[PDB]
Design a binder for this molecule. Structure first.
Ligand SMILES: Cc1cc2nc3c(=O)[nH]c(=O)nc-3n(C[C@H](O)[C@H](O)[C@H](O)COP(=O)(O)OP(=O)(O)OC[C@H]3O[C@@H](n4cnc5c(N)ncnc54)[C@H](O)[C@@H]3O)c2cc1C
Ligand SMILES: [Hg+2]
Length: 420
């Protein structure tokens, strides 16, 4: 069915904050499971950036496809035809060639498709609604919208990103930045020191990633070589500000700076951003003291962008929350959030800690171990082949007994003796 009908009304009212991957998933899955949903987002429109490429893992694709058959046909023209990424070191020397189902596509174009699909389902989405001043009573929780309107519900699902005000409220208590840019390759094609990046681009999109000396640079061609995007993770970050001279100065110490610098120096000033990255250690809890406010997504577990699972885990967060609310019922909303936390926390934390350790291995690699084995340098099956919704149905009763103290719970959505 291109438009699935929701289950019978469960009587549970849910307030979702954020139009990201966590918020949209929480709203869509909750609506289809019978919950009464309102989604609050501060922006007036989904931001569209041609240089914001993202990878969605198969564990999240299968969840998205279950919301409607047509969604695959909508994303198909926006999927990259790139198949492999060429990995080089900071001397511009080849290391290994890595692959990359899965969706390698544009962020804003995928959010727009999911947002339009949510409106076709009849979900109450309210843009231009800035949320703050979270509050909680016995039996209800809520927010304040635009400092003029009070809203209340059975629970509040906070997916407001890394800069979460809800996390600051719930808790009460890094130096990394990321350049990102998009460009058209007309002027770059006239530079012989930079025209190399257009080689074989009409055939398919090419991906180049450089690692070393605390810097990561990725260059991705698009549209038969007519456009390219790039991203640069670094610790040289000094209102907002972005300058191409800072990106070039970051690459200056590299012995193999010539080929990458010759490309990115053609970036137009108005198409370059330099955002600070936010990482925090795993939280003690995602659920408020009263039990009716819960953090999901980046608000609960920000990752280092090297695992390609931040959006997928935010999607898994929203599906499990909506599933636990359906299985618990109206009179056990606090139990539902505690159950979803105990299911999700081990899986999201293993990946969170895995991104921090993998971050060290990629920005300051042990080149002697990489020389003897580069295939390790470049995601396992316990992540990609997982079905969060079926696992939640399988262990829900066991987790309820563990939350109420009746029994034990062994998490099996993570590998035994598992680091990442
Ligand atoms: C450089 C980089 C590369 C990445 N690459 C990938 C990748 O390839 N694959 C992948 O899966 N993940 C990737 N990620 C991670 C991914 O971006 C995030 O994990 C994911 O977007 C988290 O979603 P979210 O819903 O939690 O938050 P967000 O997507 O950040 O959404 C937060 C939303 O809440 C809104 N909001 C904030 N405050 C308020 C408020 N007070 N009231 C109302 N609304 C508010 C914001 O406008 C926003 O729409 C990457 C991250 C980075 C930094
Ligand atoms: Hg498809």
């Amino acid at each position: 069915t291109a438009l699935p009908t929701p289950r019978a009304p469960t009587g549970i009212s849910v307030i979702v904050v954020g139009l990201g991957f966590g918020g949209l998933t929480a709203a869509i899955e909750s609506h289809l499971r019978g919950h009464s949903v309102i989604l609050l987002e501060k922006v007036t429109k989904v931001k569209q950036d041609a240089g914001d490429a993202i990878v969605i893992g198969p564990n999240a694709v299968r969840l998205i496809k279950s919301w409607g058959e047509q969604l695959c046909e909508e994303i198909e023209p926006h999927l990259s035809n790139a198949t492999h990424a060429e990995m080089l070191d900071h001397h511009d020397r080849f290391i290994v060639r890595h692959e990359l189902k899965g969706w390698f596509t544009n962020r804003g174009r995928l959010i727009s498709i999911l947002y339009e699909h949510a409106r076709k389902l009849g979900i109450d989405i309210r843009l231009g609604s800035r949320v703050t001043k979270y509050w909680e009573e016995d039996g209800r929780a809520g927010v304040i919208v635009n400092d003029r309107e009070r809203l209340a519900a059975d629970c509040v699902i906070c997916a407001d990103g890394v800069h979460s005000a809800a996390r600051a409220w719930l808790t009460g208590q890094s130096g990394w930045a990321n350049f990102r840019a998009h460009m058209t390759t007309e002027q770059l094609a006239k530079d012989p020191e930079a025209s190399w990046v257009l080689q074989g681009t009409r055939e398919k999109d090419r991906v180049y990633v450089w690692f070393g000396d605390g810097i990561n640079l990725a260059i991705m061609t698009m549209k038969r070589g007519q456009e390219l995007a790039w991203a640069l993770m670094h610790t040289d970050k000094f209102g907002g500000r972005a300058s191409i001279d800072d990106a070039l100065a970051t690459l200056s110490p590299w012995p193999g700076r010539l080929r990458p610098s010759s490309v990115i120096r053609h970036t137009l000033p108005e198409k370059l951003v330099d955002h600070a990255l936010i990482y925090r250690p795993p939280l003690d809890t995602w659920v408020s003291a009263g039990g009716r406010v819960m953090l999901i997504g980046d608000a609960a577990h920000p990752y280092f962008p090297v695992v390609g699972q931040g959006g997928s885990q935010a999607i898994e967060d929203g599906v499990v929350v909506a599933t636990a609310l359906e299985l618990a019922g109206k009179e056990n909303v606090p139990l539902a959030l505690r159950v979803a936390e105990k299911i999700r926390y081990p899986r999201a934390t293993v990946i969170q800690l895995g991104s921090s350790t993998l971050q060290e291995h990629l920005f300051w690699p042990d080149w002697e171990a990489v020389a003897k084995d580069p295939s390790v340098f470049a995601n396992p099956e316990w992540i990609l082949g997982h079905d969060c919704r079926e696992y939640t149905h399988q262990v829900f009763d066991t987790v309820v007994r563990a939350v109420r103290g009746e029994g034990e719970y062994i998490p099996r959505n993570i590998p035994a003796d598992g680091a990442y």
